[PDB]
Design an enzyme around this catalytic site. Structure first.
Site, PDB file in Angstrom:
ATOM      1  N   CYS A   1      44.063  48.401  45.889  1.00 38.77           N
ATOM      2  CA  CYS A   1      45.286  47.614  45.879  1.00 38.77           C
ATOM      3  C   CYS A   1      45.396  47.192  44.425  1.00 38.77           C
ATOM      4  CB  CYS A   1      45.274  46.378  46.795  1.00 38.77           C
ATOM      5  SG  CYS A   1      46.641  45.244  46.329  1.00 38.77           S
ATOM      6  N   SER A   2      44.790  46.059  44.085  1.00 41.44           N
ATOM      7  CA  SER A   2      44.866  45.553  42.726  1.00 41.44           C
ATOM      8  C   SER A   2      43.514  45.540  42.030  1.00 41.44           C
ATOM      9  CB  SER A   2      45.463  44.142  42.743  1.00 41.44           C
ATOM     10  OG  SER A   2      45.871  43.754  41.451  1.00 41.44           O
ATOM     11  N   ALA A   3      42.613  44.686  42.499  1.00 39.69           N
ATOM     12  CA  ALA A   3      41.286  44.584  41.913  1.00 39.69           C
ATOM     13  C   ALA A   3      40.301  45.607  42.481  1.00 39.69           C
ATOM     14  CB  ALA A   3      40.736  43.167  42.111  1.00 39.69           C
ATOM     15  N   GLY A   4      40.589  46.127  43.672  1.00 36.04           N
ATOM     16  CA  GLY A   4      39.694  47.085  44.306  1.00 36.04           C
ATOM     17  C   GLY A   4      38.514  46.351  44.936  1.00 36.04           C
ATOM     18  N   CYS A   5      38.758  45.136  45.427  1.00 33.90           N
ATOM     19  CA  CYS A   5      37.694  44.325  46.023  1.00 33.90           C
ATOM     20  C   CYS A   5      38.005  43.658  47.360  1.00 33.90           C
ATOM     21  CB  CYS A   5      37.272  43.228  45.041  1.00 33.90           C
ATOM     22  SG  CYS A   5      36.650  43.845  43.492  1.00 33.90           S
ATOM     23  N   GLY A   6      39.066  42.859  47.387  1.00 32.79           N
ATOM     24  CA  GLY A   6      39.422  42.123  48.590  1.00 32.79           C
ATOM     25  C   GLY A   6      39.806  42.953  49.790  1.00 32.79           C
ATOM     26  N   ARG A   7      41.095  43.257  49.897  1.00 33.82           N
ATOM     27  CA  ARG A   7      41.593  44.065  51.000  1.00 33.82           C
ATOM     28  C   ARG A   7      40.847  45.402  51.025  1.00 33.82           C
ATOM     29  NH1 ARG A   7      48.195  43.247  50.552  1.00 33.82           N
ATOM     30  NH2 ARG A   7      48.170  40.944  50.481  1.00 33.82           N
TER      31      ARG A   7
ATOM     32  N   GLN B   1      36.976  39.183  48.999  1.00 35.41           N
ATOM     33  CA  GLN B   1      37.114  38.022  48.137  1.00 35.41           C
ATOM     34  C   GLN B   1      37.451  36.674  48.759  1.00 35.41           C
ATOM     35  OE1 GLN B   1      39.905  40.132  45.311  1.00 35.41           O
ATOM     36  NE2 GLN B   1      38.366  39.517  43.793  1.00 35.41           N
TER      37      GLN B   1
END
Length: 302
Positions: free
Chosen positions: A227-233, A274
């Site tokens: 998605c954005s950071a490649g961590c949360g979702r 996250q």
């Protein structure tokens, strides 16, 4: 074999657990603490990501891929391409390169993103957010819509043949051409991630995963998630899919633990999952999957 027994115990353990939003809060803070603290000075080196030449290739300077599990790029196109991209491989049920957790590409890493997809023969790409979401631009456009002019990143040309619109996400059939060769990549683009509410998002997310697994049943090639950071979702989906694979393979271990699963994935990609809400989502999704597998066990019972 012993799955019915194992799953049942897990199910009874949950229908007999206070399970307050407070326990989740404390439990998640505890997970973040023990997964990031109590290390040696040199634990989890990220030297390559910190190289002067790669500094500008990271969306978030505090989210750097571990050296040991980073996705190395050996496919060379121009004479300014290094082996670096902000991404890590995450082990699956059958293979060590089941998933690729990566950040949403930057305008300067669009070429590297495609280099990665091509080099590792990725078939499925899962984008866990709309490009523009809740007032923020999540990542740069690396795909095209039907009828739009083809996009070109270095030697790569990307176009969209078709696009299937579903309930909570759409599916783009992308065609990418490299050296006279053309491949098809299926990009699942989730466009209805709940604001602040996991209960309502369990089913749609399981639907996404079920759909994805209709295209790829194993870990023969990496599934790229971001998605954005490649961590949360990104972590929510890897954790849920991984768990589903264990269930389908009938291999859920005794004393299965969501806390431990997340810590296990955090050893391969930093900050996987996250927020507490995302954590609760994984927990709730897993419970629902345990219930669904139990339905499968009972239905098949001859």
């Amino acid at each position: 074999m012993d799955q019915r027994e194992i799953l049942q115990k897990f199910l009874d353990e949950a229908q007999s657990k206070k399970i307050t939003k407070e326990e989740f809060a404390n439990e998640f803070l505890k997970l973040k603490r023990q997964s990031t603290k109590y290390k040696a000075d040199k634990t989890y080196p990220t030297t390559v990501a910190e190289k002067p030449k790669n500094i500008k290739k990271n969306r978030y300077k505090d989210i750097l891929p571990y050296d040991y599990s980073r996705v190395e790029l050996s496919l060379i196109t121009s004479d300014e391409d290094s082996s670096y991209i902000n991404a890590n491989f995450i082990k699956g049920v059958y293979g060590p390169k089941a998933y690729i957790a990566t950040q949403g590409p930057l305008s300067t890493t669009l070429l590297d993103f495609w280099r990665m997809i091509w080099e590792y023969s990725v078939l499925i790409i899962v984008m866990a957010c709309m490009e523009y979401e809740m007032g923020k631009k999540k990542c740069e456009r690396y795909w095209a819509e039907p009828g739009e002019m083809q996009l070109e990143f270095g030697p790569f040309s990307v176009s969209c043949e078709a696009e299937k619109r579903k309930s909570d996400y759409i599916i783009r059939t992308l065609k990418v051409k490299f050296n006279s060769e053309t491949r098809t990549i299926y990009q699942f683009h989730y466009k209805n991630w709940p604001d602040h509410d996991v209960p309502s998002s369990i089913d749609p997310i399981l639907e996404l995963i079920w759909d994805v697994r209709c295209y790829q049943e194993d870990d023969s090639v990496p599934i790229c998630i971001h998605c954005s950071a490649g961590c949360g979702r990104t972590g929510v989906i890897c954790a849920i899919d991984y768990t589903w694979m264990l269930l389908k393979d009938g291999i859920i271990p005794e004393n299965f633990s969501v806390f431990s699963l997340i810590r296990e994935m955090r050893t391969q990609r930093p900050s996987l999952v996250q927020t507490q809400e995302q954590y609760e989502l994984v927990y709730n999704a897993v419970l629902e999957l345990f219930k669904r597998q139990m339905d499968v066990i009972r239905d098949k019972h001859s």
